[PDB]
Symmetry: D3
Subunit: 231 residues, 6 copies
């Protein structure tokens, strides 16, 4: 039994019952195989240097993530990436956490099908990064469209070559709570109770974090990866 640490890189703008649900799913799955033992889950909010449209301050995303995991036994938040001045490629974030653990459980990227399929977006990922991520760390991709993910893997010689290191976990409970729809809801003043944890909902309301204004941040700006990989 290989000891494993699930590392989820994402914006968590805001984290929702779905992001937490991701970790629960992956763990049951990996433990389920019998060849693994999930020892820890790490949430690592992206730094504001990412420049994603509508992205609020990493400070709030970390806090929410922390509040969301306050009662979680095995999942926690790591603020290293967010406190970085420069936007860090996910490969580097994976590396950092592997090297950290050697101061040995293997670190795997926890993600959804959107992330996996974004590999095809021109210039979004350095192709070597793709190879090294799946080759040297591996993905645990959770999804409600298991077949599209499986099809995407089958259509890429690189992903197919390292398929033993890419695990597609089916989500049979059609979870669709996206960050975007949560933000839309708040702007219109609708309830989001039961879509995010109580403390996260309470934290958000109290400070009216999301608004038309916030949704506008980085508007007109190129996504970090895109700028760096074209420049």
């Amino acid at each position: 039994k290989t000891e494993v640490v699930l590392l989820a890189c994402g914006s968590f703008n805001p984290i929702t019952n779905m992001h937490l649900r991701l970790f629960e799913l992956a763990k049951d799955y990996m433990n389920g195989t019998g060849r693994y033992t999930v020892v820890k889950g790490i949430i690592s909010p992206v730094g504001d240097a990412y420049k994603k449209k509508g992205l609020i301050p990493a400070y709030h995303r970390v806090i929410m993530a922390e509040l969301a995991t306050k009662n979680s036994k095995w999942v926690e938040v790591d603020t290293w990436e967010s406190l970085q001045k420069e936007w860090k490629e996910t490969l580097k974030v994976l590396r950092h956490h592997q090297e950290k653990l050697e101061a040995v459980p293997k670190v795997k990227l926890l993600c959804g099908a959107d992330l996996l399929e974004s590999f095809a977006v021109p210039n979004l990922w350095k192709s070597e990064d793709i190879t090294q991520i799946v080759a040297n760390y591996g993905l645990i991709c959770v999804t409600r469209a298991g077949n599209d993910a499986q099809k995407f893997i089958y259509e890429s010689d690189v992903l197919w070559k390292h398929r033993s290191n890419i695990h597609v976990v089916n989500e049979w409970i059609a979870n669709d709570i996206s960050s975007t729809k949560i933000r839309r809801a708040l702007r219109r003043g609708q309830s989001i109770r039961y879509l995010v944890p109580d403390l996260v909902q309470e934290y958000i309301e109290k400070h009216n974090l999301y608004s038309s204004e916030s949704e506008d941040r980085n508007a007109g700006v190129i996504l970090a990866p895109l700028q760096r990989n074209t420049a």
Copy 2:
């Protein structure tokens, strides 16, 4: 502005984040129209006499229902229906809760999902005069991710179309079908249901080891009360 009470009659076996979500959605919709003011939400678990397959004992359901709403300022649980000896037609439950409020009165509206609305078509499941009285004298607030289907269903029925002003279809754009069936199945397999139900409900289920192959077989082969009654 009309004050209104949303009454959700269901099995809640078990209740999940989605049932709680149904109430939040319906209240936002109603208050948002500008002509209503939602004052209270009432969860009324069905009596064990319903005989639905896999239906665990009514008392546990009420508790999880109460646990899930312990921190709910406006939604509460009512045990009147579950305490009755014979299975209770939804129309009577609605009536009971309306008479009860008249003691300037708020109106009780049946809160439900599309499946319940559409079940009106199952032969011998609902007495036709009951449907008529429900939509005419109380009304339905139907939450669902299949809006056209609910609208179509209503459109295909003369009685529903006729009382269409008393039937409100509320769209759930943030789909999340956390159904009881899938929760029960996850539990039978020792999978986590954390974040699918409120923490206290999860824990309650844990401790009492509520769901299993055994519980799921309850009533196996027994005809559903309504069907049994309405056919006799």
Copy 3:
């Protein structure tokens, strides 16, 4: 009860039973809610300055629309828009009619999901026009794809905000009869009997209205709204 005037701006190239049907449905719906009284329907053909491809001359489209409503006891044609020298924004046509009335029924725009959704085409509609149209006048969107329309409304903050003034009318008897299909059938010599009013059909035949030639009109030209919100 609020009196209302249904106004439909469009090309009507050519008007079909579908357009007339649109008015009947919107009227039934608005009078059905119990809180409106539809006192009139107005068809306003777009001027040739619109420059849409295949658009035949305005006078032909006005006459056909007039022939079509000759036997309507409540729907009529208004030629203001079509007589202006420069193409006119729909907000301007709505405003013209609302004022002409105040010389009071409320003018509401009658349209299909199509136009509703063109609100998203880059540079087709000025964002303030949309806000003013939905907030100050109103929209009655008649369509077969009700969920698509509802969804479109849900996905936009302005529309959602003024949703109380937007009405989606389900067309349960799915009819299509698009102008494009009618011109296509005419080019092929196929029968359009029962798809348009006999008088319109007879006129189309008398003047041999539609052909490959007519179809090339404004070929290459940039649609007025676009030329204007760009240029």
Copy 4:
């Protein structure tokens, strides 16, 4: 070039613009093949003994069809079927018309939609030899918005496939689904059906209040003539 007569057997309860289009489309298609010449169209309302649910008196349906075709240069109404005390099988109506033409003779083909074609699979509705003789000795011109389905249906039936040269599937690219059922529903609800049926038909219907809750109940609980007779 083979001269053809398009015969449409149906309830026409009531006739709508869709039934008229049907003839237009089929005529264009047959003439467009370069191998046929459509000389006449025939609308044949079914007699009351068919016993279909909601079927109003035959005499009215006949009058509506005549009103509907008053301005048609080539489609006409035949009452033979409406005057039969015992419901007649479509194969018999086809034979009746062909024998009539015989009195260089045009061939009678059945004009219908996908619904009638696929109804061939309903248990007991059509005697198997009837299906065989109709497709082998007369022919079908099936108009539909679902061409692949109709082809699939044909492909899945040894008899249909065998005689596929006599079954013409005609694509309806301008979708039209003005069903009689949706027309009656509209009328019961006091909705406008203008532009969905010809003006004279709408006017006749409105003048005599032909469609209502009561008319819709006609023959409720009764078994459709073909089914009763083929199960006897």
Copy 5:
């Protein structure tokens, strides 16, 4: 590395390129996992006592299967099952082959989604049988409807419990050369060249194997398993 024998029970009425393809796919998948070595493939035609409608005599089906595998280096036909007088439960056919080997490679059932899904048909399979098959042997399900097969496994407690002994193999190159379609094609005189091995094709033509008559076989008769488990 576990050695495995893929056993496929079926009617093979007639066998086709797709049944052969099934074995190739399963083999590539199982060997590809890096923890299996497929040492043999076994085609076990069903006996005539099965009474399935349209089912021609076993001797013709066995012979066609041998002609089909004459040129296979690893797939062969086993006639045991078909030589029995009473129709044999698939679990028994499996137990048989496993014991015959123990005279050790593990035998697994090779099948398509249909068979897997027919596990839900009332009275078709004894539930103890379903449990012993997946628990004691294994199922390699090859299919175009991967997610459906997966959903079906997810919806059954028995199958889910032993999911580790069940492998859904995706068939990215869609094939649907069903026997039913082959028979239908033969009845109408259509070519089946390139859908079945040339020798099978030649055999079918020489003995005029399929027709309306043959299709009538067992018409009205109750399929053996239903008869048994029911009476």
Copy 6:
């Protein structure tokens, strides 16, 4: 009864069972109408000047095609195109074969829906060519998506006008053995047995024809037709 010659122009990179099926289907269909007699089938591999990505040498494609039709009674391979130093438009290939016959059966282009639909790709086919192909020769289009091909025809005035020369043939036994998927399987060391003829699979295996390298042939080069028609 008009005699007809089926001419399939294509890359055949490599030829598969599906291309062979195309001929069987088309022939059963045309002879089935009762008004045509299919006298011959011609497979015509494109020349290397076509420059399609992943196209291996013409000599090999021609050999695989010869190997595949060795035992065919009526389908042969014509090498004219493969020997052209300049890529030839399909209209010319049709004209080459038609005059050759006039040295009288009519040659018709056999193809699938992809090819037919490619008629709409900007600059791929000269409009006059499309016209002449369907006006003067004819297309027999075999496909799993008949309505899509029928709709494509209905939406084009030229195709519709000569619809009597375009025969859509339904493929009820769904088969999608694309060359792209065959090459994918080969690069991955997967079996392609029973998807292509035995001799073809053996020739491919013996020469390692398909690989990552072969797949890069012509990368970045513009397809002959596009280059020529844009120039």
